[model samples]
Target: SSVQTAATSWGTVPSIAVYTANNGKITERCWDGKGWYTGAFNEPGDNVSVTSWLVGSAIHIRVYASTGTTTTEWCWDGNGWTKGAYTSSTVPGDQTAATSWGTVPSIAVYTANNGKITERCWDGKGWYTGAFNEPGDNVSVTSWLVGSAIHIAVYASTGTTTTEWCWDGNGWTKGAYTSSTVPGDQTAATSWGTVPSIRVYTANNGKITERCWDGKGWYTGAFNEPGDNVSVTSWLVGSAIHIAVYASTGTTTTEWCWDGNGWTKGAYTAT
Candidate 1:
């Protein structure tokens, strides 16, 4: 089975979360910049799913059962795995996606039966549910923090067209729509400094397409990475914005990095 991975940075230290399934059990592994740590086994049946995000020195993880009807959330409190407080009777259609900016953390899940996107966010005190809205099927969500606002983008497809629904810390609105085909149900979006950017696989050419929200509008850039299963992470390396992509297959994985301007490719080695 394929592995699901998530990466986050706290100050100068980088942490990673890897979830894999074997037989009928699902396990989680963590890398805390120095060594790897393993978590307790979770039996979420077969084909388990995981998604994560970082808040300050903590990394939050959400795991889903194969039926997509049950979920459990865990957090890495800079040292070890700790259970979090999550109360939701609404089972998810897909995996639960989360993002954090400053002290606030937000999670979004797709409810297939009603074609609604439900969200729960932390407002310094407790988790509160947000307004329910529709964004179609196969939802892929990512978020970025600009200034003090938490900007979220949810991409979903209806027929051959994909639409982007955005949250600008205040209200939900429709952002952009693309007529191009999306090969997979994934999107990589983050902020380099305060600039928000995203990359997704284009079905037409089997290439990665990059787009950035430039305050006033959106700017699209062309990238030459020739893969469909891609994941991206960005961090500020000194004055430059360092963007790294992990393109993986079942057998081999490749790492590509973009330093604000150019691209560099290298072999991926596990630590």
Candidate 2:
């Protein structure tokens, strides 16, 4: 995950890593102000998965079980990888899921579990909680944004205890979260209204999906696999969409793009 400057090419790799279970290998691909590097795994256990990326100036990451379950997780700043204050080791009946939402120079994630996942954001305000998720739903989440306010989506169970979405200046408001419709379970929602769009990977199958949400309805599109738990970006222009992903398929972190016709590799040149 090499970061390239629009001006220069040299930068850093994405600070975050999101992965699934490793059956036999642990690939550690990184950047060091030079170019790129890699490290293989030689260990044991059921295996672990990671999701790491830069959000604002801070980094947001999550690790879960590939085969069994997850323990604790980690996050690295410009300083180094530090112990994340948030940890989700599910108990007996509870299951935990984590995801991030934001553009660049500003990002956020729905960290923690059940009753604690907040709309935690890094608005250059030193990584603090925000009044995003309401009290109704158990999960609090948002999408990566490039500009303006980031798109937000969350899921939670409701029955005996109803879940809702809300926002405050800095605390969880009781009821404020709103959507055109009730969002599906574990589904990421962002309106790419009238813009060229892209989707990223979350599962191991590399099944990335993109849809259009104009003033009318939703139309879905099928794209090729772009690898697991990676990030994709698209710039909206007129009625067309230009898409790219931070991919690990080519033995390196490259930016690949689709221009409504076909897939083209190396859109994101190696730094």
Candidate 3:
């Protein structure tokens, strides 16, 4: 009885860490291009959720307990993982999202009890926590470094309608929901350089849809994928924005990739 967390890489040699859970025990293994090292484990009880992101040359990770009241974080500061203090008292929903802007890394979680999305950001010195006005059942967040500022996009919904709240480095702006397709609970959002794209599942047809902000306004479209609980990530290479979509069928994963124009469907892997 084990499960794997999402993998992330950083540094010049591109070191990667893949997290896994074995009967409630969390273990992580690192790979330094050529070889894999001995794994590390931490016990935080069963049903705990974990998420991570890379900032600069360091890797930051956050863990939430099953009770949803306590959250602990760690950072790989060159040498080893250093434990940080628990800050947020708000009850975190099932999903934990992370993204970095400038030198600081920010983590956002939804509070089901309060119907609010809360964010905790690391400022190198300490953690700063804030609440977003937008409310929804689930939350997905991503950031991009534009000039000297970091732009953030937070996607959430009220079941009947979906909302996109954006921050253009200074203040927040709201994008009104237009599509009749109610969004799925799970969302995947990311930025390619400065352009941001968000992915969600259509509750009406179980199809994947996207909305991209191209500086002027939001351009809404749909690629391909007909599954629930779809998660996504985007990266910029040269000029094209490449996106990877991971779809879940409750017990298995089907991966689809987009190379600016269309999608290339990959194989299905069982969970």
Candidate 4:
């Protein structure tokens, strides 16, 4: 069987990334501008859920253990590995989201057993876990770092509403609920703009729409009309934000960019 991987962009200049490969086992490989590193074995699970982020150039990779109760974390700090930062006792749902600016890398998960959203943050020294919101189970969680805070969006399957939470070195607080009836079956968040604004993009009905917190208020806007539920990945590169969508329905991948003024309709590729 061929190995499948999910990669995320990090670092600048040469377009480096970290790959989480799910083959017979869960493992990882990093790109360091020159070539691929050796690799690391994550855990013995089936790689049901994986979320990763940057903590000052160090890569924090989190995945579920085979036992389902504990989670294994693997980190690469430019030279070597830091495995098992203390097995986490929290159980995560099938979907988990993580983000970091530079200091602490935080991850948010929705546990179906308790219907609660739990946050785990690494302050570059150690791990701290806390239960923040009870936004029901089956909700999609996505997060990003803006300024000194981590912003999370919990989309309720009820289809139209979402609770946005922000943790600013203190406790978590919920923002105003979004009233847009956009579908978020697939969701992602990224931080950009001149004033540290954040955007949570969703796969709306046959289109890609966004809900933004522009350092002042939360608003929604429609950008591209990609196919429904297409895969979305975003990044802040060279002072601009790039969001790419791969629409499986058309076997097409479309890219969009926002550079402080307007969004550029990006290049498209399809067979």
Candidate 5:
């Protein structure tokens, strides 16, 4: 069985969340620039997606059980895990994705039984549900909340090219696309609230594709990183954006860092 992983860089330190395939358990491990926060704390879930941001000192993390009928949001409030008060999704879904830029977070999932994309959100008080209106089979969905906009990557009803659907606090717009054929959410990073620029990294065919939103239009840049099929997560550390990519057969992941200039492979590997 293959494990699912998500990563987030919180300035100097970064963390990776792993969903153990055989155990159906999730664990979070963090690096403190010098050492790790031990082997880490565990929880229960499958198809896990994680997001974190700076609150004070403790890394605030939000996790979603990506598969199953009702995907619930779980929280790690520095000390312990909370069942969560932010997510209220009751729809049957799987292959889910999530984003947390502020105290609130949002989740997206596809109905495996039917294959419609739906989104659920947390508003600090309650969760609300909406529809993406994209009709496709069990193709995975990658969702990002950049500044005030939301972006999701999925295959359209008609083509091999990937379609990025955008949400601007309102309805979903039929979004842009990569030139190559791909349908997975590479990984995305931004301030989560204030949006000057949004960077989403994904693998196209066998190369890495970058879709950057500069508060205006979307720019597509596909680079070379052969055989990188899974981009777990990404975050900003100072001026650099770090993305972690791994394969199912590997025990660890390689960190790909992008400064203002270009991407440098392997700043560190997750242990």
Candidate 6:
């Protein structure tokens, strides 16, 4: 779920690709995502960041462009990060969400036709066959459960049919579409890509309602009113900003942070 390294030596290389720090650069020490991979961290360099969550059984990571430099990337799905891509267009913004599709992550992009949304899946090798259709404005990439079970919630677009839909790896199907008016694709997603056992929030009814998923089913819980119009467009399982909503109520919008321990309210604010 997370990755951190300390001063040590790779007594032996593992199957997964091991990310090691070298002279001011992050390199992908090959071991492939299968066996033991151990190595020493760059003597003085510290790990700037890591895309630890193995969502979609993959880890997407991107490095900064300092002096036109690119770091080697890989993914370890309980295995290791092997297949390295110098700088793939797939890495998420901020060099955080690198396109590390192990078996491929479920993806969704707005299809501007009947105001409907199209869902496509990545199966590591290639994208899945057939596209799933749904009703929405901008269908952001929601959560993709391994094996092609994806979840998408729409705000407003057109029609009342499968505003929110899911794919069971067979056919694109619709789930609870939330009967009530929820948020939509207009919100920017932070790409948690994979769902984890954690609590998430939705900006609905001018408040932030918390929801939890434990790999079984969505458990309906309580809602926390960060304040009225506190738009929680979307949030990833761990540390991701999948979908972010604007607080229509707060004069000075605040940014929330959750370190998998507790939600620290308003650590930073935006005016």
Estimated TM-score for each candidate: 0.71, 0.44, 0.71, 0.61, 0.70, 0.41
Residue-pair clash count for candidate 5: 0
When sorted by lDDT, best at the front, the candidate numbers are: 3, 1, 5, 4, 2, 6
In model 1, the runs with Cα more than 4 Å from the true position are 1-4, 12-67, 87-93, 104-115, 177-179, 182-185, 195-207, 216-220
| Model 5 lDDT per residue over 1-271, tens place | 3354555556545555433322466666566566545345566555565666566666777766644445566777778777775443433335555555544444443332355555565656666765656654333444456566665544332224345566566666766544344454333333322444555555444455566665677777543454443444555666665555443323444455554466666545444
Best by the lDDT measure: 3
Candidate 6 has an lDDT of 0.34
* Candidate 5 lDDT (Cα, 0 to 1): 0.52
**Cα RMSD (angstroms) for every candidate in the order listed:** 4.3, 9.2, 4.7, 5.8, 4.7, 12.4
Q: Rate the local accuracy (lDDT) of all candidates.
A: 0.53, 0.37, 0.54, 0.49, 0.52, 0.34
Encode model 1's per-residue lDDT on 1-271: one tens digit a residue.
3333334434434454445444445565555567666756455543333455566555555554443454455554556555567544434344344555554445554432334456666665777777746655445566776766667777655434566877886787888645344434444455554556455433223355666654556566555565544555566657666665655444244567676667788333433
- Global lDDT of model 4: 0.49
For candidate 3, write residues 1-271 as lDDT tens digits. 2232333445534454544433545555555657656545454533333445665545665554333564555555556666666445545343355566554554444333356566666566766665456667656666666677777777776555567777776677886434446544446565655544444433234555666555565566666566555555555556666665656444344557677667788432332
Give candidate 3 misplaced runs (Cα > 4 Å).
Answer: 1-67, 78-82, 90-94, 104-113, 176-180, 195-206, 220-222, 266-271
Off by over 4 Å in 6: 1-100, 103-108, 111-114, 119-130, 144-163, 176-200, 215-217, 226-251, 259-262
Tens-place lDDT per residue, model 6, 63-136, is: 22211223233333344335333332221111211112233343322332335444333444554423655445
Q: Between prediction 1 and prediction 5, which has the larger lDDT?
A: 1
TM-score of 1: 0.71
Model 1: residue 101 alpha-carbon error in angstroms: 1.5
The true-versus-predicted C-alpha distance at residue 204 of model 4, in Å, is 5.3
Candidate number with the higher TM-score (2 or 4): 4
